[PDB]
Copies of this chain bind each other. A is one copy, B any other.
Amino acid sequence: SETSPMLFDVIVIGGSHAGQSAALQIARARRRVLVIDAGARRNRFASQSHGVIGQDGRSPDAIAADGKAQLLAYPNAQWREDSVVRAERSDAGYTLICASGQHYRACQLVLAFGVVDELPELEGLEERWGESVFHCPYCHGYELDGGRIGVLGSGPLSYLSAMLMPEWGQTVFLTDASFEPDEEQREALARRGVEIVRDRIARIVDRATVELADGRRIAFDGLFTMNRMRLSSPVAEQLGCAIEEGPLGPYVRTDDAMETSTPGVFACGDITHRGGTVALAIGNGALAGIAAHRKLVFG
């Protein structure tokens, strides 16, 4: 029928750790901020979050909900559960078109839409993601309690992961024909106490048992993969933001002020070069939010 027009100083696309941290700075600067969030955090798979001082061991859902409530306590902050499908530069800033068909208008944008894990094509793996199969050992290595750990090989980068893993438990480097250690490497692994298993993996079964092509089964307490990741949205590219290749996938380029190559568009969290954890998302999200405010004031 009818509705009143709205205009936001900043719209934050993505409302998990990075976006909430950014939006909070803007809310505290008494500007109008909207978070549009599609409700699918990268960390929606594990039961606990670790490594963020003050939130260590808490449920990711509870951390997200507390942050949302704290932000929405500010009357100048608003939230929409929706997905931005198209971002357009306008004379008056930016227009966002969402999957619902709703449109929103902003002077500036903060991108905080996260990455999506692209898991190896291995039967049983995806079903155990965040339960017995993980990406980052600082996040989940401690809780393995010195047990048996499998490093699912995925190329050269898995070598360093294998070398690091004995900090947390008895490590087996399952190369899965993705990598063959040279002389130096084979010797460094042996010295580190890492066992190398070269046979192809057929599937993961039960909680965390690796079934090899030759029929062998090896039970693990946890498995790690250095998997690829992709940007969760084409919005950065739509806005003309420069995107660069990192070791494990693309990131949105940002400067010291978390600003992308497109003036007035900032980025934070996992989609930036130095993200990858909640602590970093909170930190650089705060930087992006303050930077976005400062541009509203000083251009």
Is the pair A28, B51 in contact by a Cβ cutoff of 8 Å?
A: yes
What CA separation (Å) do A20 and B284 show in the bound complex?
18
Task: Indicate if A279 sits at the interface (CB-CB under 8 A).
Answer: yes
Q: Which of B24, B146, B284 contacts A30 (CB 8 A)?
A: B146
A21–B278 CA distance with the chains assembled, in angstroms: 12
Across-interface contacts of A146 in B (CB, < 8 A): 30
Query: Closest approach, in angstroms, between the C-beta of A47 and any C-beta of chain B?
Result: 16
Residues in B with CB closer than 8 Å to A66 are 54
In the assembled complex, the CB of A46 is this many whole angstroms from the nearest CB of chain B, namely 14
A141 interface residue, CB < 8 Å from B?
Answer: yes
The distance from the CB of A59 to the nearest CB of chain B, in whole angstroms, is 13
- How would residues 13 to 56 of chain A score, 1 for a CB under 8 Å from any chain B CB and 0 otherwise? 00001001100110011110000000000000000001111111
Q: Which residues of B contact A287 (CB under 8 A)?
A: 274, 280
List B contacts of A71 (CB < 8 A).
Answer: 53, 56
Asked if A120 is at the interface (CB within 8 A of a chain B CB), the reply is no
Point out the residue from B21, B277, B294 that lies within 8 Å of A279, measured CB to CB.
B21
> Can you list 12 residue pairs at the A/B interface with Cβ under 8 Å?
A24-B51, A24-B56, A28-B50, A52-B286, A53-B70, A54-B55, A56-B71, A138-B293, A279-B283, A279-B286, A280-B283, A283-B284
